[model samples]
Target: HHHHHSSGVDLGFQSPDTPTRLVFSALGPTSLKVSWQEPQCDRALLGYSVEYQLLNGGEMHRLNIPNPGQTSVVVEDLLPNHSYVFRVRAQSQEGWGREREGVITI
Candidate 1:
């Protein structure tokens, strides 16, 4: 979706940083959990975006959170013994940036 720019309120354009303490842990053979801390910003937060794709030719999966307070999410139904690369991005109301990446094999 396009960036929402309606009112004159500052959506923290001055602050754009990467997600810190990004952690990817295996919950089971077919699931994984990702956790991270929100970046510093002055205005409203849009949400966080997460993407994971199998390195062995699996389709990419995307998950997003609308609540800025949520710091982690679970991804299930992952193929066993396969490597998946996970990337995270913190999106503010004005813009988005600082996508960090992590990879894990289930």
Candidate 2:
């Protein structure tokens, strides 16, 4: 199990500049849907990106968000009953930001 807490507003390797939140839904026998919230401002987030890898061993897959300011995304082509680790990051005119990671078993 993974657990941590932060009050937000601090951008560090250990603390999120803005709190990250996520939702997961089972899409099918071989897929899962994942979504996350964008930073809490209108600072014009350039976009969001995600990197994922199978828990056992595999190449990391990267995905780019098509819409800026969007708070959700769906990841397809996953294997059923496999565990994966995923990390997400945001970019904007300010620059690239830190990443948030989580593990999911599908």
Candidate 3:
């Protein structure tokens, strides 16, 4: 019946050389999902990269997507009420494209 309590509130932004409509949503108390639309010139896209880190400290955690069509990913085992920085960028043969970043509290 398509019944789900999914609160997918997203953040929107635009970048000429990066993905558009960057979004971050909380899936649970300690999990988050980030999604975005592919860039206009994604014909040459090879993959996508997502990097996230806590604002307080620690090294960044990275997620790589080998499929260019995939636009969303969920990061689990997060700490509640903590600030995090999430960045997404398109990868091509040349190199990684401009990174689009978003901030969220979980």
Which candidate's lDDT is highest? 1
Per-residue accuracy of model 3 over 1-98 as CA lDDT, tens digit each = 34211122121233336888679888889988899997755345666889999998878999877667889999999988889988999866545679
| Native RMSD of candidate 1 (Å) | 3.6
Leading candidate by TM-score: 1
Arrange candidates, best TM-score first.
1, 3, 2
Model 3: per-residue Cα lDDT at residue 69: 84
> Which residue pairs show backbone clashes in model 3?
81-106
Ranking by lDDT: 1, 3, 2
Per-residue alpha-carbon lDDT of candidate 1 for residues 23-105, written as tens digits (9 for 90 to 100)? 87888889888998888777666788898898876778888777778889999998888888888887776677778888888
What TM-score should be assigned to candidate 3?
0.79
- Candidate 1 has a TM-score of 0.81
Clashing pairs in 2: none
